[PDB]
Every structure is written in structure tokens, then in C-alpha cells.
mmCIF file of C-alpha atoms and ligand atoms in Angstrom:
data_model
loop_
_atom_site.group_PDB
_atom_site.id
_atom_site.type_symbol
_atom_site.label_atom_id
_atom_site.label_comp_id
_atom_site.label_asym_id
_atom_site.label_seq_id
_atom_site.Cartn_x
_atom_site.Cartn_y
_atom_site.Cartn_z
ATOM 1 C CA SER A 2 -18.339 9.807 -7.666
ATOM 2 C CA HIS A 3 -15.068 10.171 -5.725
ATOM 3 C CA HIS A 4 -11.516 9.268 -7.109
ATOM 4 C CA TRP A 5 -9.276 8.894 -4.135
ATOM 5 C CA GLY A 6 -6.203 6.736 -3.783
ATOM 6 C CA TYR A 7 -2.659 6.714 -2.460
ATOM 7 C CA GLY A 8 -0.725 8.423 -5.275
ATOM 8 C CA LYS A 9 0.767 11.954 -5.432
ATOM 9 C CA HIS A 10 -2.303 13.209 -7.238
ATOM 10 C CA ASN A 11 -5.086 11.554 -5.240
ATOM 11 C CA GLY A 12 -3.491 10.532 -1.982
ATOM 12 C CA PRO A 13 -3.919 11.485 1.673
ATOM 13 C CA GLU A 14 -2.854 15.124 1.225
ATOM 14 C CA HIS A 15 -5.745 15.605 -1.212
ATOM 15 C CA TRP A 16 -8.530 13.832 0.655
ATOM 16 C CA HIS A 17 -9.676 16.837 2.662
ATOM 17 C CA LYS A 18 -11.073 18.562 -0.428
ATOM 18 C CA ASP A 19 -13.866 15.986 -0.966
ATOM 19 C CA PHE A 20 -13.860 14.872 2.695
ATOM 20 C CA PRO A 21 -13.249 17.896 4.953
ATOM 21 C CA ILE A 22 -13.462 15.697 8.092
ATOM 22 C CA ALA A 23 -9.931 14.632 7.062
ATOM 23 C CA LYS A 24 -8.816 17.604 9.208
ATOM 24 C CA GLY A 25 -11.180 16.703 12.088
ATOM 25 C CA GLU A 26 -10.718 16.218 15.777
ATOM 26 C CA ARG A 27 -10.553 12.401 15.965
ATOM 27 C CA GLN A 28 -8.775 11.241 12.831
ATOM 28 C CA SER A 29 -6.863 7.979 12.439
ATOM 29 C CA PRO A 30 -4.291 6.583 12.371
ATOM 30 C CA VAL A 31 -2.093 8.041 15.093
ATOM 31 C CA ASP A 32 1.362 7.453 16.531
ATOM 32 C CA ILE A 33 1.138 5.478 19.759
ATOM 33 C CA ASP A 34 3.637 6.933 22.151
ATOM 34 C CA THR A 35 4.193 4.067 24.556
ATOM 35 C CA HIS A 36 5.495 6.427 27.269
ATOM 36 C CA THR A 37 2.379 8.617 27.198
ATOM 37 C CA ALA A 38 -0.270 5.855 26.903
ATOM 38 C CA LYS A 39 -1.672 5.065 30.332
ATOM 39 C CA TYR A 40 -2.489 1.702 31.731
ATOM 40 C CA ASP A 41 -6.187 1.692 32.559
ATOM 41 C CA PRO A 42 -6.834 -0.997 35.205
ATOM 42 C CA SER A 43 -10.589 -0.573 34.577
ATOM 43 C CA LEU A 44 -10.593 -1.840 30.986
ATOM 44 C CA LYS A 45 -12.426 -5.253 30.887
ATOM 45 C CA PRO A 46 -10.572 -8.156 29.184
ATOM 46 C CA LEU A 47 -10.992 -8.247 25.327
ATOM 47 C CA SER A 48 -13.257 -11.057 24.036
ATOM 48 C CA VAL A 49 -12.675 -12.178 20.466
ATOM 49 C CA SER A 50 -15.377 -14.789 19.612
ATOM 50 C CA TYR A 51 -14.697 -15.927 16.067
ATOM 51 C CA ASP A 52 -15.669 -19.624 16.300
ATOM 52 C CA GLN A 53 -18.789 -19.312 14.114
ATOM 53 C CA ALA A 54 -17.270 -16.890 11.559
ATOM 54 C CA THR A 55 -18.571 -17.348 8.006
ATOM 55 C CA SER A 56 -16.340 -15.828 5.364
ATOM 56 C CA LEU A 57 -17.870 -15.348 1.912
ATOM 57 C CA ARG A 58 -15.756 -13.639 -0.643
ATOM 58 C CA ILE A 59 -12.542 -11.729 -1.312
ATOM 59 C CA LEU A 60 -12.652 -8.534 -3.379
ATOM 60 C CA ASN A 61 -9.991 -6.215 -4.864
ATOM 61 C CA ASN A 62 -11.616 -2.783 -4.428
ATOM 62 C CA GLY A 63 -8.848 -0.826 -6.130
ATOM 63 C CA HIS A 64 -7.417 0.272 -2.771
ATOM 64 C CA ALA A 65 -6.894 -3.004 -0.877
ATOM 65 C CA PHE A 66 -8.536 -6.431 -0.765
ATOM 66 C CA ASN A 67 -11.473 -7.116 1.492
ATOM 67 C CA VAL A 68 -12.364 -10.522 2.970
ATOM 68 C CA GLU A 69 -16.078 -10.296 3.599
ATOM 69 C CA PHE A 70 -18.124 -12.093 6.252
ATOM 70 C CA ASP A 71 -21.756 -12.999 6.765
ATOM 71 C CA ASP A 72 -22.840 -10.474 9.396
ATOM 72 C CA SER A 73 -26.599 -11.293 9.178
ATOM 73 C CA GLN A 74 -26.352 -12.712 12.756
ATOM 74 C CA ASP A 75 -23.862 -12.683 15.736
ATOM 75 C CA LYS A 76 -21.518 -15.244 14.277
ATOM 76 C CA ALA A 77 -18.135 -13.617 14.864
ATOM 77 C CA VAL A 78 -18.094 -10.840 17.458
ATOM 78 C CA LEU A 79 -15.855 -8.605 19.470
ATOM 79 C CA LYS A 80 -16.841 -7.631 23.031
ATOM 80 C CA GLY A 81 -15.158 -6.431 26.208
ATOM 81 C CA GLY A 82 -12.134 -4.235 26.465
ATOM 82 C CA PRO A 83 -13.286 -0.658 26.032
ATOM 83 C CA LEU A 84 -16.493 -1.721 24.269
ATOM 84 C CA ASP A 85 -20.021 -1.525 25.561
ATOM 85 C CA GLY A 86 -22.145 -4.218 23.950
ATOM 86 C CA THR A 87 -21.527 -6.456 20.920
ATOM 87 C CA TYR A 88 -19.685 -5.666 17.709
ATOM 88 C CA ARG A 89 -20.143 -7.934 14.678
ATOM 89 C CA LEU A 90 -17.306 -8.776 12.296
ATOM 90 C CA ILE A 91 -18.082 -7.595 8.741
ATOM 91 C CA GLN A 92 -14.754 -7.705 6.928
ATOM 92 C CA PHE A 93 -11.016 -7.555 7.157
ATOM 93 C CA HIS A 94 -8.365 -5.955 5.003
ATOM 94 C CA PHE A 95 -4.745 -4.871 5.183
ATOM 95 C CA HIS A 96 -2.507 -1.843 4.566
ATOM 96 C CA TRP A 97 1.062 -2.517 3.407
ATOM 97 C CA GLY A 98 4.192 -1.005 1.958
ATOM 98 C CA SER A 99 6.462 -1.164 -1.059
ATOM 99 C CA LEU A 100 9.307 -2.230 1.266
ATOM 100 C CA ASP A 101 9.355 -3.852 4.704
ATOM 101 C CA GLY A 102 10.140 -0.544 6.501
ATOM 102 C CA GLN A 103 6.765 0.967 5.915
ATOM 103 C CA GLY A 104 3.136 -0.050 5.422
ATOM 104 C CA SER A 105 1.410 0.268 8.795
ATOM 105 C CA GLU A 106 -1.004 3.091 9.534
ATOM 106 C CA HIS A 107 -0.594 3.222 13.261
ATOM 107 C CA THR A 108 3.002 3.583 14.444
ATOM 108 C CA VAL A 109 4.544 2.693 17.809
ATOM 109 C CA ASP A 110 7.020 5.246 19.053
ATOM 110 C CA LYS A 111 7.224 6.313 15.367
ATOM 111 C CA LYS A 112 8.048 2.734 14.282
ATOM 112 C CA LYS A 113 6.367 1.652 11.059
ATOM 113 C CA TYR A 114 5.558 -2.001 10.605
ATOM 114 C CA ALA A 115 5.536 -3.779 7.230
ATOM 115 C CA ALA A 116 1.733 -3.962 7.213
ATOM 116 C CA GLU A 117 -1.386 -3.647 9.348
ATOM 117 C CA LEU A 118 -4.473 -5.863 9.457
ATOM 118 C CA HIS A 119 -7.867 -4.310 10.219
ATOM 119 C CA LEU A 120 -10.761 -6.445 11.375
ATOM 120 C CA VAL A 121 -13.829 -4.220 11.063
ATOM 121 C CA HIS A 122 -16.816 -4.688 13.378
ATOM 122 C CA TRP A 123 -20.106 -2.806 13.861
ATOM 123 C CA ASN A 124 -22.109 -2.136 17.004
ATOM 124 C CA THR A 125 -25.245 -4.284 16.816
ATOM 125 C CA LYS A 126 -27.317 -1.711 18.761
ATOM 126 C CA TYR A 127 -27.501 0.265 15.504
ATOM 127 C CA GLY A 128 -28.962 -2.589 13.436
ATOM 128 C CA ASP A 129 -26.794 -2.350 10.295
ATOM 129 C CA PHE A 130 -23.356 -1.175 9.280
ATOM 130 C CA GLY A 131 -24.597 1.904 7.382
ATOM 131 C CA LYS A 132 -26.396 3.182 10.484
ATOM 132 C CA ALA A 133 -23.471 2.315 12.745
ATOM 133 C CA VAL A 134 -20.988 4.464 10.831
ATOM 134 C CA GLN A 135 -23.159 7.524 11.605
ATOM 135 C CA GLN A 136 -22.517 7.037 15.341
ATOM 136 C CA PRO A 137 -19.453 7.959 17.416
ATOM 137 C CA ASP A 138 -19.391 4.417 18.896
ATOM 138 C CA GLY A 139 -20.545 2.660 15.778
ATOM 139 C CA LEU A 140 -17.445 0.633 14.806
ATOM 140 C CA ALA A 141 -14.654 -1.221 16.525
ATOM 141 C CA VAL A 142 -11.571 -1.884 14.379
ATOM 142 C CA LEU A 143 -9.094 -4.439 15.716
ATOM 143 C CA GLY A 144 -5.679 -3.539 14.338
ATOM 144 C CA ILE A 145 -2.804 -6.005 14.177
ATOM 145 C CA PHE A 146 0.706 -5.171 13.041
ATOM 146 C CA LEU A 147 2.639 -7.412 10.644
ATOM 147 C CA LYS A 148 6.424 -7.815 10.719
ATOM 148 C CA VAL A 149 8.499 -9.856 8.311
ATOM 149 C CA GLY A 150 10.012 -13.003 9.715
ATOM 150 C CA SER A 151 8.523 -16.481 9.860
ATOM 151 C CA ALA A 152 5.506 -17.342 7.748
ATOM 152 C CA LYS A 153 1.993 -17.031 9.230
ATOM 153 C CA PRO A 154 0.288 -20.311 8.355
ATOM 154 C CA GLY A 155 -3.184 -18.857 8.813
ATOM 155 C CA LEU A 156 -2.423 -16.204 6.224
ATOM 156 C CA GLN A 157 -1.394 -18.516 3.393
ATOM 157 C CA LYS A 158 -4.960 -19.185 2.142
ATOM 158 C CA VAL A 159 -5.327 -15.457 1.623
ATOM 159 C CA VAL A 160 -1.979 -15.193 -0.152
ATOM 160 C CA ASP A 161 -2.800 -18.042 -2.504
ATOM 161 C CA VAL A 162 -6.062 -16.539 -3.754
ATOM 162 C CA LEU A 163 -4.540 -13.124 -4.605
ATOM 163 C CA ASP A 164 -3.529 -14.269 -8.102
ATOM 164 C CA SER A 165 -7.254 -14.591 -8.898
ATOM 165 C CA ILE A 166 -8.114 -11.014 -7.831
ATOM 166 C CA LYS A 167 -5.176 -9.115 -9.302
ATOM 167 C CA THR A 168 -7.106 -6.126 -10.527
ATOM 168 C CA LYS A 169 -9.731 -3.709 -9.303
ATOM 169 C CA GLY A 170 -13.252 -5.144 -9.287
ATOM 170 C CA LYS A 171 -12.217 -8.784 -9.299
ATOM 171 C CA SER A 172 -13.590 -11.083 -6.605
ATOM 172 C CA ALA A 173 -13.376 -14.782 -5.694
ATOM 173 C CA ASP A 174 -15.306 -17.172 -3.481
ATOM 174 C CA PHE A 175 -13.542 -17.228 -0.048
ATOM 175 C CA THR A 176 -15.581 -19.453 2.186
ATOM 176 C CA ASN A 177 -14.433 -21.328 5.268
ATOM 177 C CA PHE A 178 -11.590 -18.973 6.153
ATOM 178 C CA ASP A 179 -10.885 -18.843 9.908
ATOM 179 C CA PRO A 180 -9.785 -15.352 11.025
ATOM 180 C CA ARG A 181 -8.530 -16.808 14.324
ATOM 181 C CA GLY A 182 -5.448 -17.826 12.365
ATOM 182 C CA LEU A 183 -4.487 -14.161 11.951
ATOM 183 C CA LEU A 184 -4.213 -13.292 15.647
ATOM 184 C CA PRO A 185 -1.034 -13.069 17.771
ATOM 185 C CA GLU A 186 -0.805 -14.959 21.100
ATOM 186 C CA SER A 187 -1.400 -11.923 23.300
ATOM 187 C CA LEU A 188 -4.520 -9.730 23.287
ATOM 188 C CA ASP A 189 -2.723 -6.864 25.085
ATOM 189 C CA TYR A 190 -3.825 -3.648 23.369
ATOM 190 C CA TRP A 191 -3.955 0.100 23.113
ATOM 191 C CA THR A 192 -7.252 1.863 22.524
ATOM 192 C CA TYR A 193 -8.403 5.353 21.526
ATOM 193 C CA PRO A 194 -11.321 7.017 19.716
ATOM 194 C CA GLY A 195 -10.784 7.692 16.023
ATOM 195 C CA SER A 196 -11.931 7.350 12.504
ATOM 196 C CA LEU A 197 -11.918 5.330 9.329
ATOM 197 C CA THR A 198 -8.472 5.725 7.786
ATOM 198 C CA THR A 199 -9.856 5.834 4.234
ATOM 199 C CA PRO A 200 -12.450 8.132 2.741
ATOM 200 C CA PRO A 201 -15.091 8.848 3.931
ATOM 201 C CA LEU A 202 -12.944 9.225 7.087
ATOM 202 C CA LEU A 203 -15.968 8.979 9.389
ATOM 203 C CA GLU A 204 -15.322 9.589 13.083
ATOM 204 C CA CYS A 205 -17.119 6.444 14.216
ATOM 205 C CA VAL A 206 -14.370 4.082 15.357
ATOM 206 C CA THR A 207 -13.153 2.730 18.664
ATOM 207 C CA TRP A 208 -9.632 1.590 17.755
ATOM 208 C CA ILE A 209 -8.168 -1.457 19.491
ATOM 209 C CA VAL A 210 -4.547 -1.958 18.385
ATOM 210 C CA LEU A 211 -2.821 -5.119 19.559
ATOM 211 C CA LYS A 212 0.648 -4.688 21.018
ATOM 212 C CA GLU A 213 2.030 -7.966 19.680
ATOM 213 C CA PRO A 214 2.667 -8.089 15.944
ATOM 214 C CA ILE A 215 2.170 -11.217 13.912
ATOM 215 C CA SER A 216 5.055 -12.444 11.815
ATOM 216 C CA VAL A 217 4.587 -13.113 8.114
ATOM 217 C CA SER A 218 7.211 -14.222 5.613
ATOM 218 C CA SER A 219 8.881 -12.074 3.014
ATOM 219 C CA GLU A 220 7.263 -14.316 0.373
ATOM 220 C CA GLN A 221 3.813 -13.688 1.810
ATOM 221 C CA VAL A 222 4.140 -9.899 1.791
ATOM 222 C CA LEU A 223 5.757 -9.964 -1.648
ATOM 223 C CA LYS A 224 2.558 -11.510 -2.960
ATOM 224 C CA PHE A 225 0.496 -8.665 -1.486
ATOM 225 C CA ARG A 226 2.707 -6.332 -3.504
ATOM 226 C CA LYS A 227 1.837 -8.096 -6.778
ATOM 227 C CA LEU A 228 -1.764 -6.887 -6.589
ATOM 228 C CA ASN A 229 -2.869 -4.010 -8.787
ATOM 229 C CA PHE A 230 -4.734 -0.786 -7.989
ATOM 230 C CA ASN A 231 -5.763 -0.608 -11.675
ATOM 231 C CA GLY A 232 -8.479 -2.504 -13.468
ATOM 232 C CA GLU A 233 -7.995 -5.364 -15.975
ATOM 233 C CA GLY A 234 -6.283 -4.322 -19.177
ATOM 234 C CA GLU A 235 -5.167 -0.983 -17.733
ATOM 235 C CA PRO A 236 -1.475 -0.147 -17.232
ATOM 236 C CA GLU A 237 -0.059 -1.728 -14.133
ATOM 237 C CA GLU A 238 0.045 0.270 -10.927
ATOM 238 C CA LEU A 239 1.212 -2.032 -8.173
ATOM 239 C CA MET A 240 -0.946 -2.035 -5.048
ATOM 240 C CA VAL A 241 1.663 -0.871 -2.529
ATOM 241 C CA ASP A 242 1.813 1.900 0.047
ATOM 242 C CA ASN A 243 -1.936 1.904 0.645
ATOM 243 C CA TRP A 244 -1.547 3.463 4.102
ATOM 244 C CA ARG A 245 -2.498 6.851 5.519
ATOM 245 C CA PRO A 246 0.188 8.413 7.735
ATOM 246 C CA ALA A 247 -0.306 9.356 11.376
ATOM 247 C CA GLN A 248 -2.696 12.214 12.098
ATOM 248 C CA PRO A 249 -2.749 14.751 14.913
ATOM 249 C CA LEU A 250 -3.732 13.255 18.280
ATOM 250 C CA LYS A 251 -5.504 16.450 19.350
ATOM 251 C CA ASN A 252 -7.406 16.152 22.676
ATOM 252 C CA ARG A 253 -7.202 12.329 22.873
ATOM 253 C CA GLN A 254 -5.824 9.829 25.302
ATOM 254 C CA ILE A 255 -4.471 6.433 24.299
ATOM 255 C CA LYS A 256 -5.126 3.830 26.974
ATOM 256 C CA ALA A 257 -3.179 0.585 27.486
ATOM 257 C CA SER A 258 -4.742 -2.666 28.677
ATOM 258 C CA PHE A 259 -1.395 -3.793 30.153
ATOM 259 C CA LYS A 260 1.292 -2.452 32.480
HETATM 260 N N1 LMS B 1 -18.612 4.852 2.073
HETATM 261 C C1 LMS B 1 -18.315 4.177 3.231
HETATM 262 N N2 LMS B 1 -19.116 4.320 4.269
HETATM 263 C C2 LMS B 1 -18.810 3.660 5.388
HETATM 264 N N3 LMS B 1 -17.776 2.860 5.635
HETATM 265 C C3 LMS B 1 -17.007 2.757 4.549
HETATM 266 C C4 LMS B 1 -17.186 3.369 3.332
HETATM 267 N N4 LMS B 1 -16.152 3.039 2.467
HETATM 268 C C5 LMS B 1 -15.385 2.261 3.173
HETATM 269 N N5 LMS B 1 -15.849 2.036 4.432
HETATM 270 C C6 LMS B 1 -15.241 1.177 5.457
HETATM 271 O O1 LMS B 1 -14.068 1.813 5.956
HETATM 272 C C7 LMS B 1 -13.032 0.851 6.015
HETATM 273 C C8 LMS B 1 -11.700 1.573 5.899
HETATM 274 O O2 LMS B 1 -11.347 2.231 7.126
HETATM 275 S S1 LMS B 1 -10.307 1.502 8.104
HETATM 276 N N6 LMS B 1 -8.968 1.395 7.296
HETATM 277 O O3 LMS B 1 -10.793 0.206 8.389
HETATM 278 O O4 LMS B 1 -10.250 2.462 9.143
HETATM 279 C C9 LMS B 1 -13.326 -0.058 4.860
HETATM 280 O O5 LMS B 1 -12.650 -1.324 4.954
HETATM 281 C C10 LMS B 1 -14.822 -0.221 4.981
HETATM 282 O O6 LMS B 1 -15.141 -1.208 5.956
HETATM 283 NA NA1 NA B 2 2.768 -13.142 17.056
HETATM 284 ZN ZN1 ZN B 3 -7.942 -0.241 7.203
#
């Protein structure tokens, strides 16, 4: 079994030993250079259809927390944009920092945001998530930056349950959560082909990164930082700085949906 994390001894600089694709040709995240990204007038508009989303549970996995969805049918889907076909929402999670000046995985002109939300979806043409991750177009991850300012009302239900999943392996019922409350106003985005940003680092992702951050309050992000990477009864290691830094762009083009 693998023992990866974000520390000096098990962090991103170590991952390539168990997961050699860490040094691959389409790794994520990347820096988005806004003056190199090209507007692609042929991208179709992005369609986020989350009205029938059914959340189930929230889990501390020792790396982040995952809000899990019922993906047994096309409840909540992502379509359009760069995507061919239908991608089903399976879960969301975040990456965040120890301080407000870092925490995002993607960067924008080298700017780091306080956190980044990932809504993970799988291409329904492959039948299940495990099959989808073996395909170069198997996943679509919708990434949304967080900055500290005003509170995000749609985030508070998440914040308030974190006390009940402090440590690795803890979970709580998390039904009736509406992920529409986590979106910014604009769906303007950048897109490029990449990977999972955690082990196993599979090169199966179409990334769609929204240009507009959401604002969350300092109190909200402070509560993220009270989580623990460790298990119950173990010495406290605060769950902070669970982000991978930018990786080499290599042959890839980042496209913009907007001028
Ligand atoms: N063994 C595995 N096989 C396939 N997928 C796996 C996985 N472990 C985690 N994920 C997935 O990879 C995501 C992390 O990558 S990210 N930050 O969204 O780019 C996790 O949230 C899981 O959905
Ligand atoms: Na916003
Ligand atoms: Zn992620």
C-alpha cells in the first residue's frame, strides 16, 4: 500500500518513485499564462446541470475531504465546452494553504489563490469511474479558485460539518447539499489536457478552470485548516498545504473560452 502525502518526507517531490507518471507529458496542475492562452471561438458554451444532484456523505481521507455524490444515474452532469458527451459528477474536494497566499494548485500568471475546489466528473461512455480513469478523455475536473473576502453562503454547510470529520477515516452523512452554491457568476474558463493532481497521477483529465474565483471568508478557510491529516488519537498534523505545485506544460496549449 502507498504512503503519500504533502510533507517533506512523502510530498510531491517523492511521488515519482511509486508513481513514475509524475514526470509524464501531461501532468497537472500548471501555471496558466493568461498572455499565452488563446481564445478559441470554437469552444461550445459550458453546461453545468446540477439540479438533480444527490450528495451522500463527507469523508476525511487523510489528504483532503471528499463530498461524495450518487453517480448511479445522470443526476448532476457537465457537458459542452471542450467536452464531447456527458460527464457525471462523482465528488468534490478542495486544496488549500496554511496562509491565504498559497493553497491553489493551478496558478494564474504565477498567482496562487488561497484554495482551489475540484468538482470531479467521469465520461459516461466508459460506464464507471474506474474504467474512465484508464482513458485519456475519461474525466473532466471543474476547478474553481477561492480567495478570501466575503463569506460564501453555499459553503457554510460544508464548513459546519468539518468538526465531525476531524481525522483521517472519519465520515458523516452529507445529504441534500447543492453544489450550485459553490459556483461563481461567470462560467468563463481555461481548458487543457492533464492529469489527476494526486497519486496515482493518471493522465485522464480534461481540466476546465474557471476564470472567476469565488470569495470565502477568513473564518471559513480557517475551519478548513483545523482538519487533521492524522487519524484519531494520533499526534496532530494540521491538514494544510495539500496542494501540488505547477508542473511542466510540455507540448500543451491552454485555451480560453473568452476574449
Ligand atoms: N486510485 C485512484 N484511482 C483513480 N482515481 C483516483 C484514485 N485515488 C484518487 N483518485 C481521484 O483523483 C482525485 C484527485 O485528483 S484531482 N486533485 O482531482 O486532480 C481524487 O479526488 C479522486 O477523485
Ligand atoms: Na465569485
Ligand atoms: Zn483535487
